Design a protein around this ligand. Structure first.
Ligand SMILES: *[C@@H]1O[C@H](CO)[C@@H](O)[C@H](O)[C@H]1NC(C)=O
Ligand SMILES: *[C@@H]1O[C@H](CO)[C@@H](O)[C@H](O)[C@H]1NC(C)=O
Ligand SMILES: *[C@@H]1O[C@H](CO)[C@@H](O)[C@H](O)[C@H]1NC(C)=O
Ligand SMILES: *[C@@H]1O[C@H](CO)[C@@H](O)[C@H](O)[C@H]1NC(C)=O
Lengths: 122, 120
């Protein structure tokens, strides 16, 4: 199977949409336990898939920042600015129509992403 | 890739959700051209997944009937009653409750499904 059971496949990745709510760091610890990360949204097409599937509640994704800084990926590098992220918060999430930001201690649903099983990067 | 580009993978199948609208027979022709069929919805659970992604438009699916007669999948097997397909029409589609039906010449979006390329 390209993706784990109950994950959703889309363009060489596998996505998990949570049932539970957790804070941002706890959501990342959950994704890390599944050999994945909080969604690393790398194109506008991926964004659109996520907004369409997720349904009505806010979902954490894997971008964080410091107040006067750029948004960073989980690996600590500045991200590629595929879409605007609104608000004045430290952790990013998806809402009804796009990406916004809030404090990392708030409990939200989350999305994990990883590569499908047939992807090689060598 | 398990699925062709932009199809959504779920539980060893791939699903195509159209952006365009067609009548039911031409929708099944599109699906067949991409080595698939109009979605042969297998169960209430598969239903809940298609309902999650499809968004507000009506989408044709792979069941139809002759007047009076039981619903049949594209493959010829009679529907197994995991949920009702409502209405008075010959051709089935998904609204946001579950399945409803209409005249086959009208214009709706559609969903295709097929087994992913690693099934065997
Ligand atoms: C996040 O939530 C956990 C319980 O899930 C709590 O123990 C932790 O202190 C909270 N905040 C952070 C930043 O870990
Ligand atoms: C860091 O993570 C991002 C998001 O997946 C990836 O696109 C980028 O190539 C990675 N950068 C490094 C230096 O590993
Ligand atoms: C017809 O398709 C349905 C829905 O997936 C499946 O349950 C049934 O086994 C199929 N019959 C054959 C012969 O493919
Ligand atoms: C359905 O549409 C196709 C064109 O894609 C056409 O050949 C066919 O006549 C239409 N069927 C009906 C009943 O209007």
């Amino acid at each position: 199977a390209a993706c784990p059971e109950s994950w959703i496949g889309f363009q060489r990745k596998c996505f998990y949409f949570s049932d539970d709510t957790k804070n941002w760091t706890s959501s990342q610890r959950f994704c890390d336990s599944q050999d994945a990360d909080l969604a690393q949204v790398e194109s506008f097409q991926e964004l659109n898939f996520l907004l369409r599937y997720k349904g009505p509640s806010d979902h954490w994704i894997g971008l964080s920042r410091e107040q006067g800084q750029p948004w960073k990926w989980i690996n600590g590098t500045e991200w590629t600015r595929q879409f605007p992220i609104l608000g004045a918060g430290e952790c990013a999430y998806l809402n009804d129509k796009g990406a916004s930001s809030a404090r990392c201690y708030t409990e939200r649903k989350w999305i994990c992403s990883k590569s499908d099983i047939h992807v090689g990067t060598k």
